[PDB]
Amino acid sequence: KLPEAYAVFKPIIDVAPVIPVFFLLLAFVWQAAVGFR
Amino acid sequence: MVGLLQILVSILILLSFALVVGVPVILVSPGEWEKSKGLVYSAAGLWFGLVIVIAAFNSFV
Amino acid sequence: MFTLKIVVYTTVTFFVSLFTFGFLSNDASRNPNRK
Amino acid sequence: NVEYPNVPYLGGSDIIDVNNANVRVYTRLPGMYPAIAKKIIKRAPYKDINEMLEKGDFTAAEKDILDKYLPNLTALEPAPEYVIDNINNGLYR
Amino acid sequence: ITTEDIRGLTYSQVKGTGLANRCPEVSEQNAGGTIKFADDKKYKVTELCLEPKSFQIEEEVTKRRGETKKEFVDTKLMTRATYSLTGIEGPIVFKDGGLTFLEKGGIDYAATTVQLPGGERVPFLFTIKELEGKFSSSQVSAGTELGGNFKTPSYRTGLFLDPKGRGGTTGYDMAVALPGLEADGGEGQDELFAETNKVFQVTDGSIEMAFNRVDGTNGEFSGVFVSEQLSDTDMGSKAPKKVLLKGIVFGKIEEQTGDEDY
Amino acid sequence: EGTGEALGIDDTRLIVPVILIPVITFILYAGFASEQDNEDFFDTYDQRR
Amino acid sequence: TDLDENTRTVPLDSSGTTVILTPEQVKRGKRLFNSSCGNCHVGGITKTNPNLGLEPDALSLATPARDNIDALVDYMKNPTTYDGLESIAELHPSVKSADIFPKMRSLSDEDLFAIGGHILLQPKLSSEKWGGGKIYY
Amino acid sequence: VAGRDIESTGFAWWSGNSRLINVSGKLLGAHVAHAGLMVFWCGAMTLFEVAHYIPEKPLYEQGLILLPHLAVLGWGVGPGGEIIDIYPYFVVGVLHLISSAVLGFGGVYHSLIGPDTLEESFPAFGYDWRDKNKITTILGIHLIVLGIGAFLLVIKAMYVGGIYDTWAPGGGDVRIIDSPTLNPGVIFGYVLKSPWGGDGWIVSVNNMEDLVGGHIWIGIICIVGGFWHIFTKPFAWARRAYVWSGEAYLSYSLVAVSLMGFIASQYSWYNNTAYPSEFYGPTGPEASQSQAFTFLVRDQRLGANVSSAQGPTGLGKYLMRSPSGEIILGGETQRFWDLRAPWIEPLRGPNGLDLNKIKNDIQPWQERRAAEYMTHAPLGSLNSVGGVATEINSVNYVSPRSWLTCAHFFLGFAFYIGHLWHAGRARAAAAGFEKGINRENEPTLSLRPID
Amino acid sequence: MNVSVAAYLAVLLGTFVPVVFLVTLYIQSESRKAGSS
Amino acid sequence: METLVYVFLLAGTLGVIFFAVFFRDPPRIAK
Amino acid sequence: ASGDFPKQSYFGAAPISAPFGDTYGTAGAPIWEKLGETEKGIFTRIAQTTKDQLEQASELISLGSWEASRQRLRMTMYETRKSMVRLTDVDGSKDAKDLFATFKKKLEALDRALVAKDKALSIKLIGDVRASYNKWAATVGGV
Amino acid sequence: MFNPTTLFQLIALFLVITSGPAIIVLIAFRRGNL
Ligand code: CLA
Ligand code: CLA
Ligand code: CLA
Ligand code: CLA
Ligand code: CLA
Ligand SMILES: CC1=CCCC(C)(C)[C@H]1/C=C/C(C)=C/C=C/C(C)=C/C=C/C=C(C)/C=C/C=C(C)/C=C/C1=C(C)CCCC1(C)C
């Protein structure tokens, strides 16, 4: 478990490892924003 | 105390949201890279200062 | 058994060396677009 | 062996053939499985249950348990095909 | 290889070299001893290792269906390096007019296979299980010989199932793949009874170890042996063939500790 | 097998082919190589043979 | 049918008294069983020693009889052989041997109660699945 | 839009990164941002493992894959591989997560607002893919960096705390590797060993002295090679034997990294020294040999003479001989007779498992370890149902070894495919027919017909 | 092996008859092509 | 004896493959 | 039956089929405490047996057995480090911890000697290891 | 009741999910170099 002083931030750390997947997805939205140049 | 460190980490969290969502916008939007870099670099400095302050106050517990 | 071993080693080394020094002999140039 | 008339006493009936029965059958009789069955199977070939009680080197409590479960025990002719598999017959669960 | 040399080698050196299957021997430097059996002292054998170096099979001299003449033949091993028996141990007792060694443990069997000239494969269980050996004296020394008979169990046990799911202790009791043959009310599958009726039959063999080196310091002895037994019967389907093994033997004699539990 | 010899070389004889056959192939390749224009170039590959 | 109290009533002591497990108790017992001993005792069997399973027949014929909550709970702290003559606490997970078995360290008396309740509740759920093995999967 | 559309580049959006080949600064930003992604995942995932770590279960039973690495490096673990403290794991996680912010800022900078090409404003950093000397200097700098990393592991193992030796006397423990093996015949003896059964190539490291000494060798090798490449240019034999374009370099890196992926997968599957079984759980061979050991102990305890017990087929039910004669555990564990683990070597003599130790001196802790490793075999389903495929849903478990091995075998094969694609394209583009066959000068029509 | 005996005829003739049919269809056609010239 | 038939059929298939590879109708461009 | 609504919980931990919540530490304080009677007995037994194990290691070294001598230090001694840690923490003494570390380093050096097959260094180091272990034994007390 | 743990996880996840797209919407509105 996290150190006591940090356990309150568990719900953020629970979503923390998964952001790289979103980065890939963000790329597509960016290319969707410029209409797939 | 634990509460003060929690407040410091939450402030770093909100500042990191601000940096993540604002630095790309300031970078890409026209006439904003050097027009308003004074906020960007000061925010980065405050971010790192918060990191060191959180480090020390965490060392106390 | 050892005779078969050295014969197989001879054969394997022969073909591997041919492969090695053949692809090292400017294989990239052997295309129809050269010059 | 398409015929083996002493099958009922291999662990499926109320009587246990001591000479060529697996250790697992002694789980059916309380208080005999880990300790008493080891000494039962050690000196496995017995002429009869009386020779088992005399020869098995049982302690007094072990003899009391065996006195409780005497009618559930017999000793028929040893079968080599079954004696070899008396501690582990590949029947687990 | 001497026991003093095996201790010197680590497992990494010995692994994969074939030295694990090789039976040790008593050194010529440490020889000329006498393992005397003092009274009021129970003795026992340990580490009785038997490496067979030559395998011979009593094969019929011709493929005639009524051939009765048979001569032993040289064989080559399909299995590799599993032949030697190690760790055999047993009590030494005054059962009869002389001392006798009773086999009661160790690896004491090897399910080896050999191939004869012509390409026929004979599997057999090289074993000394349940041996009753009799020493040729009251003291083990060079020239002393230990010999006796042993009971070789079946190559396959009851739990073994043939390719059609038939065994001794388990399996089908019929040729399930021929229901029309079992449909007949007169004979049914009675012709295939010999192959369907799996029988665990324990055979007989004899061994004659002759000790050529003995040491009194360690209790160790070494020499040669010749053993005779029968081959695999496939639960009674096959007819056993006589197997004549010869090779080297190592062993040691110590005092019974009371914890052996023989 | 499982002994750990380098390249399976348990006998020293095995090395003679393993080292010499590449050397004869290397000698034959050197006659090709020495005939080439071995100066540098600024290209993705050399078009000179 | 619901998880009625007839299913949730299990024997408590050796005399014959019963106890009605609560849904929280059986839920916690199932979770604790799957987490602390499922690796060997999945399905009411014993992977390491299949001669002795958790089916009610084996527990009833144990010495002492382990077909009740108090006997099971005592086994979880003072495990013994099937005849109750040798202590196997060094080879079995027990609360008194939790340093060498780090899964039993956090269990309390109520946790042991719930685990025993799960064990005694299972055979009522299936006629042969609990301790039956592959044949009834 | 210039340089970022199909019209001005010829690359579609789905080949979008192919527009970065000749844009050096923007490509630098791509690399730095992706490195930020890597360190971000490291920090976030190890923080996630710390948050989800319960002190009851071992690491391998909780689905933890990263904390085992730190435990092996010697942080927060005591004797017996017992994780006593998890604060250094938190420190490593926060350090990686914070460094990810810096690397992400750098990557986004160079990608968006930094100079497009570095070859006019920063000639020191700018390069051309066809300029062999500059590319070799960059390669040599990175080689020096890799050597520094190897020496960092060496410093950790030798001076700063030391690493976890599972083979340590007594139980496994964190200890200082004071005398690494620097003999070339051992370190490069591993490199030339065969990969097949019993040999294992470099997966067969059975001690930390060889590991640390060969990491010293790798550090020396990499630094020497980096200084070699900084001060040298490719020789004529090399200059004609390679395609000198960015895609070719990418394909070379792809094949190398694919080979590394395969090797790492088998490291996690088979090795139990750099991947101790008390952090990553049992290997498959370890679990099988443990099953055989557990039932050997059980049946011996119940009166059987395990050495003389005959199995169904005539072979040993518990103990038999390996094909080379060593006394080994029987049954289907016979294939896994090459296992060597710190819990089973104690009973191992020169000629295999010593029968005297196997009969009289099997300790209770060995039985406990064998039972644990039996019940925690690598078998499991994709939805994490531990046990054989025909098991029921009660045990939630897949070994970390299975996850790591399968993932890295997958990625190794995928990166071999990527190598094949990129090497073929590099050759075709260098020769100049990666867009199609020229209808004017078709090579086949000039060729004489066969047959 | 207690195998069938007409299976030999079945296999051999079911291979032979179509094979000779194909060979005849090829030879006829070629002959005709040669005769045309 | 069935091994004779099996071997003959496999060899015949291999022979057909050989003749198809090496005695094919040569491709040529029409005019 | 004919109009009975299915049960429905919206990410609730109350239901029997909900996966939320911890499995351990929910129903009371643990029964187990560190250094209990049986576990302290086990560690005491291991520490006492380690003397004999060391003596057997010295004998194996004297006879030159290298595999067996190495395995003697990991056979019945694989729990030595944990047992020594647990009993040293009971002692709570600096000198006990120093002798603990000294024994560990001496044992590692002895292993490094045994792989080298150095008979003289092996004998010297097993002697030193035994002396250090007996010193720690007299220090922590009870063994 | 809705689990507070699951609830807070969902707030965190959804704020994260609007983080990235909000950037792109901003630079779309501010007419930056997409
Ligand atoms: C690891 C992932 C990765 C990385 C690092 C990059 C990087 C890059 N891509 Mg991209 N790309 C990717 C995946 C990736 N790509 C994928 C999966 C696809 C397929 C859809 C593409 C498709 C693609 C195309 C089609 C093109 C690129 C291009 C580029 C380059 C220029 C970007 C630009 O100016 O856009 C401008 C983008 C924006 C203004 C949108 C805003 C993006 C923001 C900055 C993201 C926010 C990140 C983060 C939250 C900020 C943290 C800040 C920090 C201080 C904390 C850049 C180096 C371009 C190129 O080659 O140019 C020469 C180009 O044309 N990429
Ligand atoms: C792959 C990595 C990489 C590379 C090759 C480059 C290359 C470049 N960057 Mg940089 N950059 C990077 C990462 C990288 N950057 C990152 C991560 C960031 C985010 C912090 C930046 C942020 C950045 C900015 C904001 C700018 C550049 C610019 C430049 C250019 C000038 C560099 C210079 O003047 O150095 C000078 C070097 C220094 C000042 C560093 C001095 C060393 C300090 C004291 C640190 C010491 C560390 C120590 C040795 C580490 C110990 C290791 C131990 C733990 C083992 C050049 C093209 C400039 C540019 O392109 O302008 C148009 C520019 O303005 N970069
Ligand atoms: C990232 C690592 C790296 C890379 C990309 C390169 C790249 C290059 N080096 Mg090398 N080099 C490196 C590290 C690296 N080097 C290091 C650390 C050293 C040690 C000091 C050297 C020493 C060196 C020299 C001395 C020379 C090169 C040269 C070259 C060029 C030719 C490479 C070639 O054809 O190899 C060919 C490779 C072989 C023929 C086989 C390698 C032999 C080993 C021992 C094989 C052993 C078997 C192996 C274990 C089998 C399984 C492996 C498995 C992973 C598949 C090229 C620019 C040449 C050049 O032009 O330099 C200016 C040259 O002469 N390099
Ligand atoms: C989704 C992407 C992904 C993810 C999440 C992972 C995740 C992982 N990979 Mg990776 N991997 C990937 C893709 C991915 N991989 C791909 C595509 C490949 C190519 C096929 C690989 C190939 C690969 C290999 C070859 C290996 C891994 C391994 C690993 C694991 C350890 C990571 C690590 O430390 O690397 C190494 C980290 C670095 C190189 C960064 C620098 C490290 C520095 C130098 C360390 C300094 C240490 C020192 C002691 C610190 C203190 C200093 C001082 C105080 C003394 C981890 C589970 C390892 C594993 O466990 O495999 C079974 C492993 O060996 N991966
Ligand atoms: C070191 C890693 C690396 C690097 C730096 C590059 C770099 C590049 N690749 Mg890629 N590539 C890699 C690995 C790498 N590749 C691997 C491992 C493969 C094999 C699978 C490929 C296969 C590949 C192909 C087929 C092509 C490229 C292309 C390119 C260029 C543009 C890619 C782009 O913009 O994608 C933008 C990103 C996306 C559109 C996102 C796509 C995400 C996919 C759909 C998810 C994965 C699907 C599935 C699970 C994959 C199964 C793979 C199988 C083998 C197991 C660029 C130079 C293209 C090019 O123009 O080359 C010059 C091109 O045609 N690559
Ligand atoms: C201090 C503390 C205490 C307790 C634990 C806690 C976690 C709260 C911890 C706090 C940690 C904090 C606040 C860490 C901060 C880290 C941050 C802000 C990390 C950010 C990293 C940035 C990264 C990767 C950026 C990479 C961006 C990339 C590739 C973008 C890609 C793209 C580019 C470049 C162009 C085209 C579009 C596309 C494809 C999307």
Ligand SMILES: CC1=CCCC(C)(C)[C@H]1/C=C/C(C)=C/C=C/C(C)=C/C=C/C=C(C)/C=C/C=C(C)/C=C/C1=C(C)CCCC1(C)C
């Ligand atoms: C700074 C900080 C503080 C707390 C700790 C923490 C580590 C979290 C850290 C966070 C840092 C960072 C950098 C967080 C940023 C988060 C980001 C950028 C999230 C991005 C989310 C992206 C999303 C939804 C994208 C969804 C897009 C979709 C489906 C597009 C749909 C599609 C399109 C457009 C076309 C093809 C078909 C398909 C795929 C359906």
Ligand SMILES: CC1=CCCC(C)(C)[C@H]1/C=C/C(C)=C/C=C/C(C)=C/C=C/C=C(C)/C=C/C=C(C)/C=C\C1=C(C)CCCC1(C)C
């Ligand atoms: C670090 C560590 C950890 C555990 C203990 C251990 C002792 C293993 C220790 C030491 C490890 C060591 C020293 C590892 C070193 C590995 C080495 C040197 C691996 C060698 C890899 C070399 C490879 C692929 C070479 C392939 C090169 C090729 C095709 C070159 C190209 C070409 C050639 C040659 C001819 C044909 C045409 C082409 C394709 C252009």
